[PDB]
Nucleic acid binder design. Structure first.
Ligand SMILES: [Mg+2]
Ligand SMILES: [Zn+2]
Ligand SMILES: [Zn+2]
Lengths: 105, 91, 1116, 194, 77, 151, 290
RNA sequence: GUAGG
């Protein structure tokens, strides 16, 4: 990386290649706005529906939880949880609570 | 920030800084392109190459941070910790 | 006859000797190197003509130089007697297209002769591909046209120097014998009143011990040195005596730590100086040494001898004694004198052939070392010529020269003039020579010897001032490597026709007159008094018949680029320097037009340049079409020439070629049949001729700026095509192969509207910033989707497929219409580098018009940026109603001392509307009548040679007698000015203004390339400060000087943000972007990063740099 | 650095000749080389100046002492008249008068009042030959150098505010014309060291 | 309607320094900007713009306008 | 006076004119140091460079202690030597010559307090010159009671 | 004896013991400061410190191996000398004998070489840093401006103020969301340019020229949109920068914080710098044509 | 490396 870069002075091949680990502020703030808007639309729905979808898709922890995995803290059945998840997906699929999330993809 | 004191660095201080000890000239595998063990770029001395991914793969997710997997000994944290932690060679 | 179009000439003296082949420098040297048919033809032509010429080709010279290899037994040997070449497989255009180094095979007949077997075995062996010089002096390497430039250096031989030492209060004399390749030896006298020798400056020593070490005895040395008390003092002070004692002393001093040994010493000195391999003095070295030291015909080739050593000792001591004239040592009487290194007698230029010969010689020496090692570790009778050699050294070295070497430079194809001035330039920078930092005041400045050998005007005006220089117009190369110039022979006060070529030193002997000096009707001098020059650059005069040589033409000193400027004598030195430096940067336009006012040499500088397409047979044209022109000769050969259309040049400009010749026109051999870029009827045309007036105008032309009509924008008068080529490679990676395809992931359907099914954009589909040109997709990335993305996809019912888009897009700020796309594939017959499966290169071509910010300049060093393009009506319009196309500040002209531009303008006007002068009978009228420039029609060009240019009386008389343009009136007053009506207000201006035609060029410093802005972009890796440059969205640098300015104001906060938030702080940067876009106040910066890197580095040197606080440890 | 015996006998309007052009180039190229070298030397000098002078900062409103520095108000005073010095502007203007002045038993310039055209003109008219201007050399301040002694700045036309960077502006002012100096001995005269 | 819209000399006399003025105007502008970014939590400590406001504006211009009108004040701790 | 006159006559030759305060700052900076001679009671080395302020403090200390003061002489030194000799190692290292100064500071164990300009620019803190100064940073802005009454 | 006293006193006064003169363990750099980044095409790239570390490690290992087995004094002494040669190169290559050339075309950058010189860490990455929110372009004279006005091309202004333009677009409801606003600004529709013309005003930008000899090199201006791609500058202030118009280029920095813009309003304004500080004479009244 | 400043 300390090669002359073909230039006798003031240059180094080590100062011409961009990295990839660096966080792009644009993408980061877009993600933050996505998180806030999704949390807002999530609060718009019922608090119970909100909580169950959040725990299923893991919106507070990195790893999502399985259906029956939610039926221990909340004390519900593996098929009840599936049913409320299904009707949550049905409601969120409504064009009402989709537009604000369309551009986010 | 009130001063930047500088003095002669003894052997004990160099040991204190070190989070391990280098024992080989290895850097990476020629076929897997991953850092080798106990040489330069070793994960067990400097830090994981990817965010929260241990070398063996016992831990790969973000939730269970601040723990060392007994397989390879890597400590799951942000990759940026590599930029700070330092080792030391013995003579 | 019909070589060039009609052009009236204002010359006053007829040039005897026509300009030589402007590009002979490269082509002849390479022809000598190859030893092809042309070189032998020239050698025999010179020999029959009597001119000296080398009869030994460089390549066969180096191959014969490597003697047959002998082992410790010397049983076997290998002779490389003869080489040969065959037609190269690839065509020049094909090599340019497919990235192939244009080359031909090199076969040599190797003969292995062994005495132990007593047998000779002959075999033809292929040594390696050899790059070849095309007919235009350009080396096509990897599809890029490189050029190699001759290099000035100090020729080998004996040199002497005298200096003054303040401490000694007396002069100190020194000498050196600089070799071609071997180690260098120096010899100082009266350093402290004694003498000594530097053997590579190893240690202090005397001359006496060296002489004793040689076979010459003390007695004979005293006998030959008894006439100089200095040497007597040296030796009587010398305590040591005897050859062996001196030998062991010098051996111990040179290589201490081991006991002395007689044979070891003897062989070491022999290897150091008398071995023919270490100290091989070049042919020029001996040729110079014999003359400088006066030895009469020593060995033609060979290392230094003890006789030369004693001769230089004599020369040095004689120079010390104060004697000026002394008997030569084994030679005639000669002057003893310190020699100045700057003098062109001691400066020799390596041309292309010599450099390539040196590099291939190094390669062949490596080959000899390898094959000698192999022979030392090889068995007898398992030895063949084809097995023992190894072709790796030679090809490795030749490629390592043609790439990554200072003298191997990128061709500049801005216009044919740029090509020529790149070909001819001599560079003092290079390996084993005057580097950048080695420069001094003395070398850079001009010397009295750079006359007719190096133009003193054009040199880069940047830091490398004077370390590069163009070759003179009439210059020629000596076989040794010196530069000659012609001179007409003058006898008994008359002018003999014969011309003799003189070198740097030989010119010193005679006294040479000046071409500008008048010459009467007879061959004798018109005036007894005449200016001349003589030894040392003196310019004293000598009336009467005393001279013997005179410059063949007035334009000897000036180079080709400089000689383009008309009315050069009037301009200052600096402004002609700038003007010549600028003509190389012009860009060709959509349509070119030859200059109305300009020297008569542009035709030759165009024809000799390679860009034009000239016929090579004298035939008749049958069919004419833009793509190709078909001609037939009377012999019967049918030749069809292909005209290049819109092919990207090296710098990124079109190279379109037009067609001149009609269908039924005849042709003489060499006639131009098609223009290149910036050419018209075969005559150079780098710009266009505008109407111009000198007057301040509302402050829109303040401090060099320029104002011009919108007629230029409207008629495409100043418009240039520009083609950008960008490529992508379907590389294969560990996870899998990349695919170029139409199916791109996670994009709208509309963006993929112009893309073909294969995924490559169509031809002619206009593009804009952010568009898609070719659709490439990564095989896969390890995806660990985030919870928010998972929810969004589940709600929307889409699949995040592994393949990722990495398609090439048009770069930001770039527009254009695609004209051409080329595709190469692995599985097809085409070969690509390893790994890559497919490559696609796409052209985008646009037509940039002249707009605000574009630079502009003329030929006399007057340059400025456009500042306003006013409408057509706002321009102050002349009396008849013609607007003035461009307005120039007059304040610049007296201050910048370039009065010529003014003269040109008047003559320019004179060329637009023709002049009629018949029977007027005035002095200028008679001069015009005899010259022939008496009757002219409007629009015809005029030629004013660089130093034979028109005087002011002629211009005034012509202005007085311009042809009536309309209504029988002259719009310009005899003073040269005209009345200009205002455009905006409408009333006439108070006094007449100067107006006329001026040639203006469009420099390549356009505004489109320079613009750059950055909100946020890439960052650097080791330290996260944003990486600079327009090619990667770089941030401007806030320097130490710049910070000083901000600290002057007392402003502390602006500095803190400039140093922490805006860069070098990754944590705060995203926070600041969040705060801005959300709408809150900026947060509080923390510590930067580069300080952390620095303390970590300083901790790695065993220094425990602690960031402490007043109350113990600090918080960070 | 030599001189020829045969000067050019023509003007750029008339048009030089060949050898005349050559011997003009002789000086032109040397001039150009000098400018490039001068920029390297002036830039280096400016850098050195700032670093030694960076520490000083005006860190006190007014001084605690009274000692001053004597300057000549008016020099080259012809017979029977008083003439102000040619370079009074770069010497005593903008300073501060530490002690009060009395020539006819009455104050003419009150203490700690700047020196402009009117005050200096009145003082020289009264016939004063020298004055005691306050200056930074004799300034005694525990912290840096007080504003009162430094006088008034030049870019503002008013007394210097506390905390201004006087060292950096001083160094920049010294270094700015270094490029503009561009002068050298036209001829050595055949003697080295004289 | 410009950066130089409030003449500087009046601001300078009230403040007494060329640096105290910038610090004090900047603090006021920060307060106003954070008030406009309050978005409704309604902290009592914050206060609004005393002088009338345009539909689009920068807080610093309003701050400097108050200083010129002199309705504010400062007191070093 | 000789130095200022010499430099000014050098400058005005072409025509450029600068005030004398600018030169006087530097000329004062040169002579700040002093050469201690007869360093008997002061107990430090003799004939080595010494800051004027520390010289005065040491002289006051020793005369208070009852011992006589070590002598000293003014010493004019170039700008370069003066910059290298500065108390703060970090600023000195940032100057042209780095290895020697870093080595000497390391062996001497000199803790650099961050007072100054070129020391704080690297750390990214606020330079203590003008708006960055302490007294100019710790005010509070309050609208007047009558202003809040106005609304 | 004076120099010896000086150095001896230093050890005596400071707690650090002299044994640190001779080190015993060699610290290593954290790896990201010596990155072995991956390049497209199967190639690689590495900072030279890796090579020096490898050499010292190899030689130490071989010395250890030779010490475990009974070995001659000559060989072990030679190896220890080699280890000394290696560690010294790591601290500073080329301070003794011939510099480790490595590939042969150039010396090898050691640890000390990064802290010293024109390209060193001090004088290229702690004093003079690069910065975002900036631009550059050729200049042309603008006489119709005032003493505090400069013309910026549309593209330059748009790329400098992108966050502000996006926030304004979402506030005016032209853009539905931040992502859609970003899409619209990258597309560059006329509504974006209208919003830009609204937002730039009453916000100072610092124009600057490269040599910046004296503190008038950086001056604040109130921006103004204009077509073309060349900045427009006021003639009067041109002579203060020493700015010709043959062909020039000027950086245009942008202050963001409240303090920075306040400073550019009060101090660095182009109208409050009439007098040059060298001699207290006016500098903003040029004379070429007027 | 070479151009422009
Ligand atoms: Mg300029
Ligand atoms: Zn693991
Ligand atoms: Zn004071």
């Amino acid at each position: 990386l300390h090669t002359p870069l073909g230039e006798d002075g003031d240059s180094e091949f080590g100062d011409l290649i961009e990295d990839s680990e660096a966080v792009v502020p644009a993408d980061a703030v877009s993600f933050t706005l996505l998180q806030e808007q999704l949390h807002s639309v999530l609060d718009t729905l019922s608090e119970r529906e909100a909580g169950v979808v959040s725990m299923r898709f893991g919106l507070t922890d990195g790893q999502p939880k399985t259906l029956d995995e939610i039926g221990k803290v909340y004390g519900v059945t593996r098929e009840r949880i599936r049913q409320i998840e299904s009707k949550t997906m049905s409601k969120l699929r409504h064009p009402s609570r989709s537009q604000v999330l369309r551009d986010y993809l | 920030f009130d001063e930047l004191r500088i003095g002669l660095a003894t052997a004990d201080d160099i040991r204190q800084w070190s989070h391990g000890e280098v024992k080989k000239p290895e850097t990476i595998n020629y076929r897997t392109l991953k850092p080798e063990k106990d040489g330069l770029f070793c994960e067990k001395i400097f830090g994981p190459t990817r965010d929260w991914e241990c070398y063996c793969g016992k831990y790969k997710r973000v939730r269970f941070k601040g723990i060392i997997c007994e397989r390879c000994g890597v400590e799951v944290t942000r990759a940026k910790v590599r930029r700070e932690r330092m080792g030391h060679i013995e003579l | 006859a019909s070589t060039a179009p009609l052009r009236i000439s204002f010359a006053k003296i007829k040039e005897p000797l026509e300009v030589p082949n402007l590009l002979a420098l490269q082509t002849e040297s390479f022809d000598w190197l190859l030893g092809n048919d042309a070189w032998k033809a020239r050698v025999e032509s010179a020999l029959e003509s009597g001119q000296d010429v080398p009869t030994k080709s460089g390549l066969e010279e180096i191959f014969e130089e490597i003697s047959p290899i002998e082992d410790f037994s010397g049983s076997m040997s290998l002779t490389f007697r003869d080489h040969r070449f065959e037609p190269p497989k690839n065509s020049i255009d094909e090599c340019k297209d497919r990235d192939f180094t244009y080359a031909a095979p090199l076969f040599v007949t190797a003969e292995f002769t062994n005495n132990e077997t007593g047998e000779i075995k002959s075999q033809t062996v292929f040594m390696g591909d050899f790059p070849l010089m095309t007919n235009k002096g350009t080396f096509v390497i990897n599809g890029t046209e490189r050029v190699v430039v001759s290099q000035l250096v100090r020729s080998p031989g004996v040199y002497f120097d005298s200096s003054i030492d303040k401490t000694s209060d007396k002069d100190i004399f020194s000498a050196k014998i600089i070799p071609s390749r071997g180690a260098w030896l120096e010899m100082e006298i009266d350093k402290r009143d004694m003498v000594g020798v530097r053997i590579d400056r190893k240690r202090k020593q005397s001359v006496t011990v060296l002489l004793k070490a040689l076979g010459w005895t003390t007695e004979q040395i005293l006998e030959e040195f008894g006439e100089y008390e200095s040497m007597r003092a040296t030796l009587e002070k010398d305590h040591t005596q005897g050859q062996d004692d001196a030998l062991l002393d010098i051996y111990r001093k040179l290589r201490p730590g081991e006991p002395p040994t007689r044979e070891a010493a003897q062989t070491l000195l022999e290897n150091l100086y008398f071995n023919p391999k270490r100290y091989d003095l070049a042919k020029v070295g001996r040729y110079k040494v014999n003359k400088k030291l006066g030895a009469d015909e020593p060995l033609d080739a060979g290392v230094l001898t003890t006789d030369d050593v004693i001769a230089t000792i004599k020369y040095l001591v004689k120079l010390h004694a104060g004697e000026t004239e002394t008997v030569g040592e084994s030679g005639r009487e000669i002057v003893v004198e310190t020699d100045d290194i700057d003098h062109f007698g001691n400066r020799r230029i390596r041309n292309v052939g010599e450099l390539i010969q040196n590099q291939v010689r190094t390669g062949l020496a490596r080959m000899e070392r390898v094959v000698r090692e192999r022979m030392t570790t090889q068995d007898v009778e398992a030895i063949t010529p084809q097995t023992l050699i190894n072709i790796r050294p030679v090809v490795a070295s030749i490629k390592e020269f043609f790439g990554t070497s200072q003298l191997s430079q990128f061709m500049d194809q801005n216009n044919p003039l740029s090509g020529l001035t790149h070909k001819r330039r001599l560079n003092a920078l290079g390996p084993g020579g005057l580097s950048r930092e080695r420069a001094g005041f003395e070398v850079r400045d001009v010397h009295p010897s750079h006359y007719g050998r190096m133009c003193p005007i054009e040199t880069p005006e940047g830091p490398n001032i004077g370390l590069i220089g163009s070759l003179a117009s009439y210059g020629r190369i000596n076989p040794f490597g010196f530069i000659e110039t012609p001179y007409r022979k003058v006898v008994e006060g008359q002018v003999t026709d014969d011309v003799d070529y003189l070198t740097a030193d030989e010119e010193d002997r005679f006294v040479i007159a000046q071409a500008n000096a008048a010459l009467g009707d007879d061959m004798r001098f018109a005036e007894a008094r005449v200016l001349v020059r003589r030894r040392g650059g003196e310019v004293d005069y000598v009336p009467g018949d005393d001279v013997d040589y005179m410059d063949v033409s007035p334009r000897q000193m000036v180079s080709v680029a400089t000689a383009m400027i008309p009315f050069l004598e009037h301009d200052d030195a600096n402004r002609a320097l700038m003007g010549a430096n600028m003509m190389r940067q012009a860009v060709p336009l959509i349509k070119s037009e030859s200059p109305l006012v300009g020297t008569g040499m542009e035709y030759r500088s165009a024809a000799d340049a390679g860009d034009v397409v000239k016929a090579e047979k004298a035939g008749v044209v049958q069919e004419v079409s833009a793509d190709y022109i078909t001609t037939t000769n009377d012999d019967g050969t049918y030749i069809t020439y292909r005209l290049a259309k819109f092919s990207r040049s090296n710098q990124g400009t079109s190279v379109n070629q037009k067609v001149i010749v009609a269908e039924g026109d005849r042709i003489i051999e060499g006639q131009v049949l098609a223009d290149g870029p910036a050419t018209e009827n075969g005559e150079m045309a780098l710009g266009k001729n505008l109407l111009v007036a000198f007057m301040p105008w509302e402050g829109h032309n303040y401090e060099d700026a320029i104002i011009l009509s919108q007629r230029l924008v409207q008629d495409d008068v100043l418009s240039s095509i520009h083609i950008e080529e960008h490529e992508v490679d379907a590389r294969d990676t560990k996870l899998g192969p990349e695919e170029i395809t139409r199916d791109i992931p996670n994009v709208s359907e509309e963006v993929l509207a112009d893309l073909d099914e294969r995924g490559i954009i169509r031809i002619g589909a206009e593009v804009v910033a952010g568009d898609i040109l070719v659709g490439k997709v990564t095989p896969k990335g390890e995806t660990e989707l985030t919870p928010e993305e998972r929810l969004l996809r589940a709600i929307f019912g889409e699949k995040a497929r592994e393949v990722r888009d990495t398609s090439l897009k048009v770069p930001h700020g770039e527009i254009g219409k695609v004209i051409g796309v080329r595709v190469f594939d692995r599985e097809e017959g085409d070969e690509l580098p390893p790994g890559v499966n497919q490559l696609v290169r796409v052209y985008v071509a646009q037509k940039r018009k002249i707009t605000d910010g574009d630079k502009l300049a003329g030929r006399h060093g007057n340059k400025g940026v456009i500042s306003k393009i006013n409408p057509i009506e706002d321009m102050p319009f002349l009396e008849d109603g013609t607007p003035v196309d461009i307005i120039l500040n007059p304040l610049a002209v007296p201050s910048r001392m370039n009065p010529g531009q003014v003269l040109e303008i008047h003559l320019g006007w004179l060329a637009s509307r023709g002049w009629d002068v018949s029977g007027l009978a005035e002095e200028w009228a008679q001069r015009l009548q005899v010259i022939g420039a008496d009757k002219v029609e409007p629009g015809t060009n005029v030629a004013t040679p660089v130093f034979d240019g028109a005087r002011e009386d002629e211009l005034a008389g012509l202005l007085q007698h311009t042809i009536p343009n309309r209504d029988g009136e002259r719009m310009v007053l005899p003073s040269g000015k005209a009345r200009l009506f205002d455009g905006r207000s409408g009333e006439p201006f108070p006094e007449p203004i100067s107006v006329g035609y001026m040639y203006i060029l469009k420099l390549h410093h356009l505004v489109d390339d320079k613009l750059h802005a950055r909100s946020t972009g890439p960052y650097s890796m080791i330290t996260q400060q944003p990486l600079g440059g327009k090619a990667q969205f770089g941030g401007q640098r806030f320097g130490e000087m710049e910070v000083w300015a901000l600290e002057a104001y007392g402003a502390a906060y602006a500095l803190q943000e400039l140093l922490t938030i805006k860069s070098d702080d990754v944590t705060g940067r995203v926070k600041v972007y969040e705060a801005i876009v959300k709408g809150e106040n900026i947060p509080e910066p923390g510590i930067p990063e580069s300080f952390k890197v620095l303390i970590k580095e300083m901790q790695s040197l065993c220094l425990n740099v602690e960031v402490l606080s007043s109350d113990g440890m600090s918080i960070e | 650095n030599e001189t020829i015996p045969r000067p050019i006998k023509a003007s750029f309007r008339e048009g030089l000749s060949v050898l005349e052009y050559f011997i003009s180039t002789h000086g032109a190229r040397k001039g150009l080389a000098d400018t490039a070298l001068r920029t390297a030397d002036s830039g280096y000098l400016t850098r050195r100046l700032v670093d030694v002078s960076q520490d000083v900062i005006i860190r006190e409103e007014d001084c605690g002492t009274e000692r001053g520095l004597k300057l000549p108000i008016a020099t080259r005073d012809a017979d029977g008249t008083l003439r102000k010095a040619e370079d009074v502007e770069t010497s005593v203007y903008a300073r501060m008068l530490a002690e009060d002045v009395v020539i006819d038993g009455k104050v003419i310039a009150p203490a700690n009042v700047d020196l402009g055209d009117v005050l200096i003109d009145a003082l020289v008219a009264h016939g004063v030959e020298e004055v005691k201007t306050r200056s930074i050399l004799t300034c005694e301040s525990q912290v840096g150098t007080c504003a009162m002694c430094y006088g008034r700045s030049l870019a503002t036309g008013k007394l210097v505010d506390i905390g201004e960077a006087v060292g950096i502006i001083a160094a920049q002012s010294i270094g700015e014309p270094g490029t503009q100096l561009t002068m050298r001995t036209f001829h050595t005269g055949g003697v080295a060291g004289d | 309607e410009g950066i130089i819209n409030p003449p500087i000399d009046e601001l300078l006399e009230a403040t007494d320094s060329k640096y105290s003025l910038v610090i004090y105007a900047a603090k006021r502008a920060r307060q106003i900007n954070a008030y406009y970014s309050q978005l409704g939590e309604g902290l009592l400590e914050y206060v609004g713009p005393l002088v009338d406001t345009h539909v689009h504006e920068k807080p610093l211009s309003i701050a400097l306008r108050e200083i010129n009108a002199g309705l504010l004040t400062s007191e070093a701790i | 006076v000789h130095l200022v006159g010499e430099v000014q006559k050098v400058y005005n030759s072409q025509g450029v004119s600068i005030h004398d305060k600018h030169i006087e700052i530097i000329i004062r900076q040169m002579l700040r140091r002093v050469t201690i001679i007869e360093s008997g009671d002061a107990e430090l080395l003799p004939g080595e460079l010494v800051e004027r302020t520390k010289f005065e403090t040491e002289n006051r200390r020793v005369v208070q202690e009852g011992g006589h003061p070590a002598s000293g002489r003014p010493q004019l030194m170039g700008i370069t030597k003066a910059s290298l000799a500065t108390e703060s190692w970090l600023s000195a290292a940032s100057f042209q010559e780095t290895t020697r100064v870093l080595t000497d500071a390391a062996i001497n164990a000199k803790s650099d307090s961050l007072i100054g300009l070129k020391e704080n620019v690297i750390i990214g803190k606020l330079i203590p010159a003008g708006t960055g100064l302490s007294r100019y940073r710790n005010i509070r802005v309050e609208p007047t009671e009558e202003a809040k009454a106005a609304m | 004896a004076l120099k010896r006293l000086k150095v001896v006193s230093a050890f005596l006064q400071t707690s650090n013991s002299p044994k640190g003169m001779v080190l015993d363990c060699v610290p290593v750099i954290p790896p990201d400061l010596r990155p072995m980044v991956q390049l497209d095409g199967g190639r690689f790239a590495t900072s030279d410190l890796n090579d020096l570390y490898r050499r010292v490690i190899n030689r130490n290992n071989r010395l250890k191996r030779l010490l475990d087995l009974g070995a001659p004094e000559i060989i072990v002494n030679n190896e220890k000398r080699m280890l000394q040669e290696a560690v010294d190169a790591l601290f500073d290559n080329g301070r003794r004998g011939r510099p480790v050339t490595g590939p042969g075309n150039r010396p090898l950058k050691s640890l000390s070489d990064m802290l010293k010189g024109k390209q060193g860490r001090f004088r290229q990455n702690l004093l003079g840093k690069r910065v975002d929110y900036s631009a550059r372009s050729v200049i042309v004279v603008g006489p119709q401006l005032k003493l505090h006005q400069c013309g910026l091309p549309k593209a330059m202004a748009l790329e400098l103020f992108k966050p502000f333009v996006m926030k304004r677009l979402v506030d005016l409801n032209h853009a539905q969301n931040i992502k859609s606003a970003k899409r619209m600004v990258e597309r560059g529709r006329t509504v974006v340019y209208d919003v830009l013309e609204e937002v730039i005003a009453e916000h100072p930008v610092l124009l600057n020229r490269a040599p910046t000899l004296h503190r008038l090199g950086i001056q604040a201006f109130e921006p103004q949109l204009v077509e073309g791609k060349a900045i427009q500058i006021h003639p009067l202030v041109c002579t203060a920068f020493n700015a010709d118009f043959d062909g020039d280029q000027m950086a245009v920095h942008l202050p963001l914080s409240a303090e920075a813009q306040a400073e550019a309003r009060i101090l660095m304004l182009s109208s409050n710098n009439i007098l040059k500080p060298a001699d207290g004479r006016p500098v903003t009244m040029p004379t070429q044509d007027m």
